[PDB]
Structures are given as structure tokens and as C-alpha cells.
DNA sequence: CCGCAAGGACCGCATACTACAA
């Protein structure tokens, strides 16, 4: 029941609530927000994969995405960048149209990068 | 009747050399 009360079934303590709120606070305080929101956004920078895809298939994908659900599209973009992966859509007929489209693009411009790097440095 | 009575080249090369979902 606690899980159902929270977004993404993810219960939060007071400190992590602050953590989730903090980006919108900085947004209102500075007008600024980090350009790459999730690790997937960073991952898809690999060989400009997302940029190449969006130019070639970006418009069509967002159209089919909203056809499945309006909650998948925000500001003419996918609500989550993991929707560039076919497996995300798999885990009904409108969904199959997306996966076939994604797989077609992969054979053309390559599979999307699924790995990213964490860099920590210290003197 | 007698004698001789193998030698080097090549020497595994290339391709494929994870894909994908659950």
C-alpha cells in the first residue's frame, strides 16, 4: 500500500524527497536545469547515436509513442529516453508498430548504446 | 653382376569471432 501511494512505487524519506524536489527548486531559482537528465541521455551521446536517430526517425517515433499513450510524450519528446530501446516497449498493436520501427532503424544506423561511464577523480 | 637407398616449398590462412529477451 505504501508503494501504491508513491510515484513509480518508490517510497521516499524526507531527505530523498528534498533530493527529488531540489531540481525544480534550482529551476525556479536560476531558470536552469541539467541538459542530460538520466544516464540514458548521457549513454546515447555515444557516436552521436541519438542525434542521428532523431534527424532520421525522431518525428515518426514520437508520433507512434503518443499513439500508444499520451503519457509517453512531453514537449514533443519522449518522457523517458529509455523509450529509444525496443526492450523498454516490450517489458498492443500500437506497441508492435514501435518495436518494428525501432528494430528497422537499428539495422540501419546501429544498435543504441546501453552503457555509460562514471568518472571519479581525486588528488 | 656391382653401386645407390630423398629434399624443400607449403607450415592453417580468411570469414563468422554473440544476439536477444526475460
A111 touches strand B (CB under 7 A): yes
| Contact present, A113 and A47 (Cβ < 8 Å) | yes
A87 touches strand B (CB under 7 A): yes
How would you classify residue A37: left for phi > 0, otherwise alpha for psi between -120 and 50, otherwise beta? alpha
How would you classify residue A48: left for phi > 0, otherwise alpha for psi between -120 and 50, otherwise beta? left
CA A35 to C1' B17, whole Å = 39
Residue with cell 501504491: A4
A91 touches strand B (CB under 7 A): yes
Q: Tell me which nucleotides of strand B come within 7 A of a protein CB.
A: 20-22
What distance in Å separates the CA atoms of residue A73 and residue A80, rounded to the nearest whole number? 8
| Contact present, A81 and A44 (Cβ < 8 Å) | yes
Buried b (16+ CB within 10 A) or exposed e, A20-42: eeeeeeeeeeeeeeeeeeeebbb
- A26: CB partners within 8 A, 6+ apart: A32, A33
CATH code for the domain in which residue A62 is found: 1.10.10.1720
A122 is in an annotated binding site: yes
Return the SS3 of A77.
strand
Domain that includes residue A72, residue range: 38-112
Give bridge partners of residue A74 from the DSSP assignment: A77
What distance in Å separates the CA atoms of residue A58 and residue A48, rounded to the nearest whole number? 14
A8 is in an annotated binding site: no
All three cell numbers of A119: 568518472
A41 is in an annotated binding site: no
The experimental method behind these coordinates is: X-ray
Amino acid at each position: 500500500n505504501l508503494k501504491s501511494l508513491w510515484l513509480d512505487e518508490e517510497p521516499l524519506c524526507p531527505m530523498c524527497l528534498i533530493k527529488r524536489y531540489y531540481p525544480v527548486w534550482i529551476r525556479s531559482k536560476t531558470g536552469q536545469k541539467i541538459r542530460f537528465e538520466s544516464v540514458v541521455d548521457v549513454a546515447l551521446l555515444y557516436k552521436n547515436w541519438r542525434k542521428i536517430f532523431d534527424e532520421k526517425y525522431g518525428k515518426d517515433l514520437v508520433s507512434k509513442a503518443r499513439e500508444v499513450s499520451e503519457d509517453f510524450v512531453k514537449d514533443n519528446m519522449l518522457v523517458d529516453s529509455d523509450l529509444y530501446y525496443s526492450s523498454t516497449w516490450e517489458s498492443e498493436e500500437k506497441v508492435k508498430e514501435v518495436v518494428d520501427f525501432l528494430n528497422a532503424a537499428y539495422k540501419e544506423i546501429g544498435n543504441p548504446p546501453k552503457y555509460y561511464a562514471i568518472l571519479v577523480m581525486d588528488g
